[PDB]
Design a protein around this motif. Structure first.
Motif, PDB file in Angstrom:
ATOM      1  N   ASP A 230     -13.634 -19.874  16.879  1.00  8.93           N
ATOM      2  CA  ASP A 230     -13.649 -21.176  16.735  1.00  8.93           C
ATOM      3  C   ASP A 230     -14.958 -21.858  16.270  1.00  8.93           C
ATOM      4  O   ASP A 230     -14.999 -23.127  16.173  1.00  8.93           O
ATOM      5  CB  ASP A 230     -13.333 -21.878  18.062  1.00  8.93           C
ATOM      6  CG  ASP A 230     -13.977 -21.096  19.525  1.00  8.93           C
ATOM      7  OD1 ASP A 230     -14.747 -20.299  19.232  1.00  8.93           O
ATOM      8  OD2 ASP A 230     -13.820 -21.733  20.448  1.00  8.93           O
ATOM      9  N   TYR A 231     -16.056 -21.098  15.997  1.00  7.67           N
ATOM     10  CA  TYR A 231     -17.199 -21.624  15.551  1.00  7.67           C
ATOM     11  C   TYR A 231     -17.342 -20.962  14.065  1.00  7.67           C
ATOM     12  O   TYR A 231     -17.307 -19.707  13.768  1.00  7.67           O
ATOM     13  CB  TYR A 231     -18.262 -21.228  16.127  1.00  7.67           C
ATOM     14  CG  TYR A 231     -18.370 -21.869  17.490  1.00  7.67           C
ATOM     15  CD1 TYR A 231     -17.994 -23.083  17.828  1.00  7.67           C
ATOM     16  CD2 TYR A 231     -18.696 -20.887  18.753  1.00  7.67           C
ATOM     17  CE1 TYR A 231     -18.097 -23.634  19.149  1.00  7.67           C
ATOM     18  CE2 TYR A 231     -18.733 -21.371  19.842  1.00  7.67           C
ATOM     19  CZ  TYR A 231     -18.427 -22.656  20.238  1.00  7.67           C
ATOM     20  OH  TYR A 231     -18.308 -23.127  21.604  1.00  7.67           O
ATOM     21  N   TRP A 232     -17.573 -21.711  12.888  1.00  4.99           N
ATOM     22  CA  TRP A 232     -17.935 -21.318  11.630  1.00  4.99           C
ATOM     23  C   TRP A 232     -18.864 -22.159  10.903  1.00  4.99           C
ATOM     24  O   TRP A 232     -19.064 -23.147  11.085  1.00  4.99           O
ATOM     25  CB  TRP A 232     -16.733 -21.813  10.814  1.00  4.99           C
ATOM     26  CG  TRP A 232     -15.357 -20.951  11.151  1.00  4.99           C
ATOM     27  CD1 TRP A 232     -14.538 -20.993  12.196  1.00  4.99           C
ATOM     28  CD2 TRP A 232     -14.920 -19.989  10.364  1.00  4.99           C
ATOM     29  NE1 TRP A 232     -13.408 -20.234  11.994  1.00  4.99           N
ATOM     30  CE2 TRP A 232     -13.491 -19.261  11.381  1.00  4.99           C
ATOM     31  CE3 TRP A 232     -14.849 -19.061   9.072  1.00  4.99           C
ATOM     32  CZ2 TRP A 232     -12.783 -18.512  10.661  1.00  4.99           C
ATOM     33  CZ3 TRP A 232     -14.409 -18.104   8.988  1.00  4.99           C
ATOM     34  CH2 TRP A 232     -13.176 -17.730   9.593  1.00  4.99           C
ATOM     35  N   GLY A 233     -19.732 -21.440   9.904  1.00  4.13           N
ATOM     36  CA  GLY A 233     -20.614 -21.994   9.366  1.00  4.13           C
ATOM     37  C   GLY A 233     -20.392 -22.578   8.328  1.00  4.13           C
ATOM     38  O   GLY A 233     -19.069 -22.590   7.867  1.00  4.13           O
ATOM     39  N   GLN A 234     -21.190 -23.255   7.324  1.00  5.17           N
ATOM     40  CA  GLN A 234     -20.697 -24.130   6.402  1.00  5.17           C
ATOM     41  C   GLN A 234     -20.129 -23.195   5.220  1.00  5.17           C
ATOM     42  O   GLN A 234     -19.861 -23.850   4.072  1.00  5.17           O
ATOM     43  CB  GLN A 234     -21.591 -25.217   6.053  1.00  5.17           C
ATOM     44  CG  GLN A 234     -22.933 -24.571   5.058  1.00  5.17           C
ATOM     45  CD  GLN A 234     -23.963 -24.148   5.758  1.00  5.17           C
ATOM     46  OE1 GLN A 234     -23.918 -23.655   6.830  1.00  5.17           O
ATOM     47  NE2 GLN A 234     -25.243 -23.947   4.983  1.00  5.17           N
ATOM     48  N   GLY A 235     -20.727 -22.035   5.023  1.00  8.62           N
ATOM     49  CA  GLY A 235     -20.346 -21.192   4.121  1.00  8.62           C
ATOM     50  C   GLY A 235     -21.621 -21.071   3.139  1.00  8.62           C
ATOM     51  O   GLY A 235     -22.281 -21.959   2.858  1.00  8.62           O
ATOM     52  N   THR A 236     -21.507 -19.877   2.528  1.00  5.28           N
ATOM     53  CA  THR A 236     -22.719 -19.698   1.439  1.00  5.28           C
ATOM     54  C   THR A 236     -21.744 -19.139   0.134  1.00  5.28           C
ATOM     55  O   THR A 236     -21.230 -17.788   0.411  1.00  5.28           O
ATOM     56  CB  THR A 236     -23.562 -18.473   1.958  1.00  5.28           C
ATOM     57  OG1 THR A 236     -24.428 -18.966   3.181  1.00  5.28           O
ATOM     58  CG2 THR A 236     -24.627 -18.174   0.828  1.00  5.28           C
ATOM     59  N   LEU A 237     -22.074 -19.769  -0.883  1.00  3.58           N
ATOM     60  CA  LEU A 237     -21.469 -19.142  -2.048  1.00  3.58           C
ATOM     61  C   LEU A 237     -22.329 -18.112  -2.719  1.00  3.58           C
ATOM     62  O   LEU A 237     -23.582 -18.523  -2.995  1.00  3.58           O
ATOM     63  CB  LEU A 237     -21.317 -20.493  -3.146  1.00  3.58           C
ATOM     64  CG  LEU A 237     -20.708 -20.023  -4.676  1.00  3.58           C
ATOM     65  CD1 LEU A 237     -19.227 -19.587  -4.287  1.00  3.58           C
ATOM     66  CD2 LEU A 237     -20.573 -21.174  -5.487  1.00  3.58           C
ATOM     67  N   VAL A 238     -21.844 -17.024  -3.122  1.00  3.28           N
ATOM     68  CA  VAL A 238     -22.504 -15.939  -3.614  1.00  3.28           C
ATOM     69  C   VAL A 238     -21.627 -15.666  -4.956  1.00  3.28           C
ATOM     70  O   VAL A 238     -20.627 -15.297  -4.959  1.00  3.28           O
ATOM     71  CB  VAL A 238     -22.635 -14.735  -3.092  1.00  3.28           C
ATOM     72  CG1 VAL A 238     -23.284 -13.661  -3.715  1.00  3.28           C
ATOM     73  CG2 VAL A 238     -23.355 -14.828  -1.584  1.00  3.28           C
ATOM     74  N   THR A 239     -22.196 -15.814  -6.034  1.00  4.32           N
ATOM     75  CA  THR A 239     -21.611 -15.852  -7.487  1.00  4.32           C
ATOM     76  C   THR A 239     -22.379 -14.558  -7.964  1.00  4.32           C
ATOM     77  O   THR A 239     -23.608 -14.473  -8.237  1.00  4.32           O
ATOM     78  CB  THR A 239     -21.905 -16.830  -8.260  1.00  4.32           C
ATOM     79  OG1 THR A 239     -21.284 -18.092  -7.485  1.00  4.32           O
ATOM     80  CG2 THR A 239     -21.058 -16.756  -9.430  1.00  4.32           C
ATOM     81  N   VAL A 240     -21.456 -13.546  -8.563  1.00  8.49           N
ATOM     82  CA  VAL A 240     -22.003 -12.599  -9.182  1.00  8.49           C
ATOM     83  C   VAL A 240     -21.545 -12.367 -10.773  1.00  8.49           C
ATOM     84  O   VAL A 240     -20.394 -12.953 -11.199  1.00  8.49           O
ATOM     85  CB  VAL A 240     -20.970 -10.993  -8.878  1.00  8.49           C
ATOM     86  CG1 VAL A 240     -21.530  -9.912  -9.600  1.00  8.49           C
ATOM     87  CG2 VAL A 240     -21.336 -10.868  -7.325  1.00  8.49           C
ATOM     88  N   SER A 241     -22.428 -12.427 -11.619  1.00  7.86           N
ATOM     89  CA  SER A 241     -22.545 -12.140 -13.072  1.00  7.86           C
ATOM     90  C   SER A 241     -23.826 -12.888 -13.797  1.00  7.86           C
ATOM     91  O   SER A 241     -25.149 -12.257 -13.482  1.00  7.86           O
ATOM     92  CB  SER A 241     -21.568 -12.638 -13.713  1.00  7.86           C
ATOM     93  OG  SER A 241     -21.534 -12.541 -15.096  1.00  7.86           O
TER      94      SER A 241
END
Lengths: 113, 120, 105
Positions: B109-120
Motif C-alpha cells: 500500500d505504499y509506493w514511491g514516485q518512481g525513478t525512470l532509468v533509461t538505457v542507451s
C-alpha cells in the motif's frame, strides 16, 4: 524460464461514460486462494495505488464503489459508479508465490467525453 | 502519512550499472521490508526483490539473481538498488514499495514516485 | 515431480500434530512453501526470508520440522482440509492435501 503463475486481464481497454459500471476481469493460469489477490489503480504519471487486497477487502481510504470478487481462477474488480477521475490502468496481483508475486498486464479504463 | 521518496532519473549506456535509492519517512514503527518493482514501457509490473529491515537478508526474482543487489542504510531509512550489466530491456520506471506492517507478506500500500532509468 | 502426503491424519483434542508434505522425483529449487486452508493462510516458509506465521495462528503454530509445521493446542474446529503449496523453479507449483480430524475420545 520457469513456470510462473500468469494473470490475464480482460478486456485490454474499457471505454465507458461517467456513472456507468466498470467490470474488470482477471484469469489466473492456476487456482489461487483469495487470500492472495490484490487490485491496483495507476493514474497517468503516478505510482500504483492499492484498492483491494485479499480479493475483496478494501484498502484504507478506498471508497465502497470499488469492490473485488471472485475465486479460484477468475477474479473481478467492479467500479459501481465510474467517475472521470478513474481514468487509469488497473492491475491485478497475486502475492502468494513470493513476497511480491506476479501481476497482470492491466486493463486501461478510459472515460468518455 | 508514510512517504517513499526516490532518487532522480538516470540515463545509462548498455553494460553499465545503475544504483537507485528511496528514503522512507512517516513510519510509526522501526521494522519494515522494502521492495523494488519495475515497469517497462507499455508493460505490466514486474517484482524485482525485497530487503529485510536490517539489510542482512534479501530475496530476488529469478530473472534478476546475479544482476541485482539491494542494501539498506538503517540510519537514514534509505534503501538502495543496484542493477548491473544494463540492457535495453532494462529501460523502465523503477518503483520502491512497502506496506503498513512489519512482515514481508501482503499487498503493497505504499509506493514511491518512481525513478525512470533509461538505457542507451 | 510428485507431491505426496499421509492423506488422512487424526489427533486428539488438546494435543499437537505435524503436518507434512514430501516433494520427490524432481530437482527443482524450492523457493517457498505455503500452508493454508481454503479461505485462510496458516504459515509460509520462504527460502530466503524465513517463516511468516498468520496472525490467526501465531501462538499455536510452530514452524517445522523442515518444510512441515506443527499445529498445537488442537480444537475440534481444526478438523478439515489442509493444503501445502510448493513454489519451485523451474517446475512451478505442486499442491499437496491433508485431511485432519481432531478427535474427542
Amino acid at each position: 524460464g520457469g513456470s510462473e503463475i500468469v494473470l490475464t486481464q480482460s478486456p485490454g481497454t474499457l471505454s465507458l461514460s461517467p456513472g456507468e459500471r466498470a467490470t474488470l476481469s482477471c484469469r489466473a493460469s492456476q487456482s489461487v486462494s483469495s487470500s492472495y489477490l490484490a487490485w491496483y489503480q495507476q493514474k497517468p504519471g503516478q505510482a500504483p495505488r492499492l484498492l483491494i487486497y485479499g480479493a475483496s477487502s478494501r484498502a484504507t481510504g478506498i471508497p465502497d464503489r470499488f469492490s473485488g470478487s471472485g475465486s479460484g481462477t477468475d477474479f473481478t474488480l467492479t467500479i459501481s459508479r465510474l467517475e472521470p477521475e478513474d481514468f487509469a490502468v488497473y492491475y491485478c496481483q497475486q502475492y502468494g508465490s513470493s513476497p511480491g508475486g506476479t501481476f497482470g498486464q492491466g486493463t486501461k479504463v478510459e472515460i468518455k467525453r | 502519512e508514510v512517504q517513499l521518496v526516490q532518487s532522480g532519473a538516470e540515463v545509462k549506456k548498455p553494460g553499465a550499472s545503475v544504483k537507485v535509492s528511496c528514503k522512507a519517512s512517516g513510519y510509526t514503527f522501526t521494522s519494515y521490508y522494502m521492495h523494488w518493482v519495475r515497469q517497462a514501457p507499455g508493460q505490466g509490473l514486474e517484482w524485482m526483490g525485497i530487503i529485510n529491515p536490517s539489510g542482512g537478508s534479501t530475496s530476488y526474482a529469478q530473472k534478476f539473481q546475479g544482476r541485482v543487489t539491494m542494501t539498506r542504510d538503517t540510519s537514514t531509512s534509505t534503501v538502495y538498488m543496484e542493477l548491473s550489466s544494463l540492457r535495453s530491456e532494462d529501460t523502465a520506471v523503477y518503483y520502491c514499495a512497502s506496506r503498513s506492517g512489519s512482515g514481508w507478506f501482503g499487498a503493497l500500500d505504499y509506493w514511491g514516485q518512481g525513478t525512470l532509468v533509461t538505457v542507451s | 515431480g510428485t507431491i505426496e502426503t499421509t492423506g488422512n491424519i487424526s489427533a486428539e483434542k488438546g494435543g499437537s500434530i505435524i503436518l507434512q508434505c514430501h516433494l520427490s522425483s524432481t530437482t527443482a529449487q524450492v523457493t517457498q512453501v505455503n500452508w493454508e486452508q481454503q479461505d485462510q493462510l496458516l504459515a509460509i516458509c520462504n527460502a530466503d526470508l524465513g517463516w511468516h506465521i498468520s496472525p490467526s495462528f501465531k501462538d499455536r503454530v510452530a514452524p517445522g520440522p523442515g518444510l512441515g509445521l506443527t499445529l498445537q493446542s488442537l480444537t475440534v474446529n481444526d478438523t478439515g482440509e489442509y493444503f501445502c503449496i510448493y513454489h519451485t523453479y523451474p517446475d512451478g507449483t505442486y499442491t499437496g492435501r491433508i485431511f485432519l480430524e481432531v478427535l474427542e475420545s
